[PDB]
Design a protein around this ligand. Structure first.
Ligand SMILES: *[C@@H]1O[C@H](CO)[C@@H](O[C@@H]2O[C@H](CO)[C@@H](O)[C@H](O)[C@H]2NC(C)=O)[C@H](O)[C@H]1NC(C)=O
Ligand SMILES: *[C@@H]1O[C@H](CO)[C@@H](O[C@@H]2O[C@H](CO)[C@@H](O)[C@H](O)[C@H]2NC(C)=O)[C@H](O)[C@H]1NC(C)=O
Ligand code: CU
Ligand code: CU
Ligand code: CU
Ligand code: CU
Length: 497
C-alpha cells in the first residue's frame, strides 16, 4: 500500500537479494525500492523520518530529498546534506513538514547524503490530481502502474575503490532483475494488465548512474507527463530515460492476451538480454504463467526525441527569444580532470555549516558563503538562463536543479533552440561534445538550491554548485522549526566537529 501524506518512515539496515546475490542495504520502509509516498496536490506532507541505521559501512547518518518538489517557504525541508540541513543522526528522527501547492505528477525520494541512495534509500513519490486534465486518457492509475528502474551494485557505495571504474551488477525493474555476471534465474517482476483497459504507467528512474532505453515488446507508449509537467500526447516505442527523470505514459492493453518482455537497457553494464537480464514481464490477465517469447525490433520506429515534447498548458518560455535574452544569463564551464569534476573551476566539497544555516546566521553575499566559489547568487524576480555545454568525461550528464523546474530551450544533439513551446522539466541530459543544452526559469523561490549532475558518483566527485536565490529574503521566506535548528548541534556533537 501507499503511505502518506502524513507518515512515519523508518530507515534501517537489512540484507536483500534483488538479483539473487545477498548484500546489506540502507532501506526505507524495509524494502527496495522504498514504499510509495503519496497524496493529492496541495496536501501537507509530514514525513517523520526515523534514522535507525547502525552499519557504518553505509553511513549511519541520513538526509532525504523529495525530488522535484519546489519546497517554497520550506527550503529547510529539501534534504541535500550540508546545503539545507545537517544529517539526522542515528537514534533520532526528523519531521519533513511541507506542502505541495501547484504540483501534481510523478516524483521520488532518496537519500541526499554522500552516495547513500545507491545503497538502497530510494522510492517513488506520487502527487495525484483529483481534477487531472489527462484523467480521461486512462482507466487505471495506482500503485500497480508505477515502474521503477534501478541500478544495483554488489559492492557497497562507500567501498567502491578509488581509481577503478564503477559499473552496476544488475538492472532492477520494480525491485527485481538478474545479474550481469554469474546470472541466476532469480524472479523477474511482473506487471499485470487486463485486455482492453488503458493504464497510466508512471516510469521513474531511481538510477544512481545509467540511462536506460525502455520499451515494451509489441506495445507503444503515449507520453502525457514529463518530470511532473503535463505534456501533449506523444506516442513513442522507446524512451531513453536518464537518472532521476520521470515520464507518465498511457499503455493500451490492445495486444493479444499473452506475455511480453519489458526491456530496460542501461548505457553501461550488461548489454542485451541474455538469461533475462535487463528485463521484466508484461502479463495479460488470462495468459499462461511463462516467460515471453517476443523480440525487440532491430531499430525502433519512433524513439522519444526531447524536442518533440511540448507542455499541455501554455507555459511558453520566460525572457527574450535569443541566446542571452534573460536578466541573468549564465554559461557554466563544466569540466573533469584527475578524478574530480568542477563547475567554473571549483570542485564541490560539502561545507561544515550548511549553506542555509550560513545565510540565516547573517552571511549575505555569495562571496561570503562556503564553500568559496561554489555558491552563486541569483537575483529575485528575474529570468535566469543557464547554458550547460557538454564535453566533460563520463557523459551524458543529467543535470538537476532543486526548487524549480525549467524550460529546456535547447536539448541534446540538436543545435536549434526553442523559445516558443519547449517542454519544462527538472532533470535534463546535457548531451555530447559540442552541445549547448540551455535552461530558463524565473526566481520566485528564495533559498539555496542545489544544481548538480544526478549521476551520484559524479556529485560525490564534485559536479555541483549552489544557487543562492534571493539571499536577502531567504530568512523571512523560510522560517525554521526548532527540530531543524537542533540538527547541526546534534550532528557536530556526535561527530566531534
Ligand atoms: C552556449 O551558449 C552560450 C550563450 O547562451 C554561449 O555563450 C557565449 O560565449 C561567447 C564565447 O564563447 C561569449 O563571447 C558570449 O558573451 C556568450 N554569451 C552570449 C553570446 O549570449 C556559449 O559560447 C555557447 N557554447 C557552446 C559550446 O556552444
Ligand atoms: C531540433 O530542435 C528544433 C527546435 O526545438 C526543432 O524545430 C522545431 O520543429 C518543429 C517540428 O517540425 C516545428 O514546428 C518548429 O517550428 C521547429 N522550431 C524551430 C525553432 O525551428 C527540430 O524539429 C529538431 N530537430 C529534430 C531532427 O527533431
Ligand atoms: Cu533526485
Ligand atoms: Cu531534487
Ligand atoms: Cu555526470
Ligand atoms: Cu540534489
Amino acid at each position: 500500500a501507499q503511505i502518506g501524506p502524513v507518515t512515519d518512515l523508518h530507515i534501517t539496515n537489512a540484507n536483500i537479494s534483488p538479483d539473487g546475490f545477498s548484500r546489506p542495504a540502507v532501506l526505507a520502509g524495509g524494502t527496495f525500492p522504498g514504499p510509495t509516498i503519496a497524496g493529492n496536490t496541495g496536501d501537507n506532507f509530514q514525513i517523520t523520518v526515523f534514522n535507525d541505521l547502525t552499519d557504518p559501512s553505509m553511513l549511519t547518518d541520513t538526509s532525504i530529498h523529495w525530488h522535484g518538489l519546489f519546497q517554497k517557504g520550506t527550503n529547510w525541508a529539501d534534504g541535500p546534506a550540508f546545503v539545507t540541513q545537517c544529517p539526522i543522526i542515528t537514534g533520532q528522527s526528523f519531521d519533513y513538514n511541507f506542502n505541495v501547492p501547484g504540483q501534481a505528477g510523478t516524483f521520488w525520494y532518496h537519500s541526499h547524503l554522500s552516495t547513500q541512495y545507491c545503497d538502497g534509500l530510494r522510492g517513488p513519490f506520487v502527487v495525484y490530481d483529483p481534477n487531472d486534465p489527462n484523467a480521461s486518457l486512462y482507466d487505471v492509475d495506482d500503485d500497480t502502474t508505477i515502474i521503477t528502474l534501478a541500478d544495483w551494485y554488489h559492492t557497497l557505495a562507500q567501498q567502491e575503490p578509488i581509481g577503478a571504474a564503477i559499473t552496476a551488477d544488475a538492472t532492477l525493474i520494480n525491485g527485481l532483475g538478474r545479474s550481469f555476471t554469474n546470472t541466476t534465474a532469480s524472479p523477474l517482476s511482473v506487471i499485470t494488465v487486463q485486455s482492453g483497459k488503458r493504464y497510466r504507467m508512471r516510469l521513474v528512474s531511481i538510477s544512481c548512474d545509467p540511462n536506460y532505453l525502455f520499451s515494451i515488446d509489441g506495445h507503444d507508449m503515449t507520453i502525457i507527463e514529463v518530470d511532473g509537467v503535463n505534456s501533449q500526447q506523444l506516442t513513442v516505442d522507446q524512451i531513453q530515460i536518464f537518472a532521476a527523470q520521470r515520464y507518465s505514459f498511457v499503455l493500451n492493453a490492445n495486444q493479444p492476451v499473452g506475455n511480453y518482455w519489458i526491456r530496460a537497457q542501461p548505457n553501461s553494464g550488461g548489454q542485451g538480454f541474455d538469461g533475462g537480464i535487463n528485463s521484466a514481464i508484461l502479463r495479460y490477465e488470462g495468459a499462461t504463467v511463462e516467460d515471453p517469447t517476443t523480440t525487440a525490433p532491430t531499430t525502433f520506429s519512433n524513439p522519444l526525441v526531447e524536442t518533440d515534447l511540448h507542455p499541455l498548458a501554455d507555459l511558453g518560455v520566460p525572457g527574450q527569444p535569443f541566446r542571452g535574452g534573460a536578466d541573468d544569463p549564465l554559461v557554466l564551464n563544466l569540466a573533469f580532470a584527475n578524478g574530480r569534476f568542477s563547475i567554473d573551476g571549483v570542485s564541490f566539497v560539502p561545507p561544515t555549516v550548511p549553506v542555509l544555516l550560513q545565510i540565516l546566521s547573517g552571511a549575505q553575499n555569495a562571496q561570503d558563503l562556503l564553500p568559496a566559489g561554489s555558491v552563486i547568487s541569483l537575483p529575485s524576480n528575474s529570468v535566469i538562463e543557464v547554458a550547460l555545454p557538454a564535453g566533460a568525461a563520463g557523459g551524458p550528464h543529467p543535470f538537476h536543479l532543486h526548487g524549480h523546474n525549467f524550460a529546456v530551450v535547447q536539448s541534446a544533439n540538436n543545435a536549434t533552440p526553442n523559445y516558443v513551446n519547449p517542454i519544462w522539466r527538472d532533470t535534463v541530459s546535457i548531451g555530447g561534445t559540442g552541445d549547448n543544452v540551455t535552461i530558463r526559469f524565473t526566481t520566485n523561490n528564495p533559498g539555496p538550491w542545489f544544481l548538480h549532475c544526478h549521476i551520484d558518483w559524479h556529485l560525490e566527485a564534485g559536479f555541483a554548485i549552489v544557487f543562492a536565490e534571493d539571499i536577502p529574503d531567504t530568512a523571512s521566506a523560510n522560517p525554521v522549526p526548532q527540530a531543524w535548528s537542533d540538527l547541526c548541534p546534534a550532528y557536530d556533537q556526535a561527530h566531534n566537529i
